[PDB]
Amino acid sequence: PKNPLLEKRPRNFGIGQDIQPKRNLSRMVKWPEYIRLQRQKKILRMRLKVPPAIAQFQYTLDKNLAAQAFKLLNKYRPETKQEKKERLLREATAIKEGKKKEDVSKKPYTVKYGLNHVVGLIENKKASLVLIANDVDPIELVVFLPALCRKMGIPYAIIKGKARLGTLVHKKTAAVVAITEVRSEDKNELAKLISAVKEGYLEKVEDTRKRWGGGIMGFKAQKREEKRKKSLETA
């Protein structure tokens, strides 16, 4: 049985009666200047009209197609420094024995990275597939790449994560990667990936790449817009 001496005392938080309870005031925090600046920078880029050469970068690969590409790319990740050092030591042992470097070593197959290198490969038409990072800052380093790939006939895709590409190439950040040539057993997988990239990405973005971006308003301004549209429809 409950103690009779325990009673409930409700607190009425109306205007001018009780001290207001501690609520979540995260929406109204006076943030530091760098946080405020990055938020308003994103907002300003949303509000202004974005020309098509930049607004084409909003459309990226979906999750399934990105994972399907990375399944091929992780087989062709480049050598790390330790693996390279081990390869040099094993080849040095064979040369110490007198055997040939052609005999002990074989043609490597890796994902090609580096911006100037990848651009050169695209111009020389050695690139089979080109993946361009979403968030390169400054954007002028990559803003010509889709048009260059369309000119050269190389299939391409814009993919989320320069950090994701840097993790492939054992760096912090890669702006662009290219597959040029694969081993014999992965040729079918590469062809299937290229066809899937074409049908999923390029056919979808052919209409929307020429359109201007931006023009999106804020939440309150949008709600005012549907309120005035509803009033106009009622009138």
Partner: peptide
């Protein structure tokens, strides 16, 4: 993407290892 509950509108510099 849940964020911290902030019961104050004041942001303080986080204390770090010295």
């Amino acid at each position: 993407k849940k964020t911290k509950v902030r019961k104050s509108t004041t942001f303080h510099r986080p204390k770090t290892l010295v």
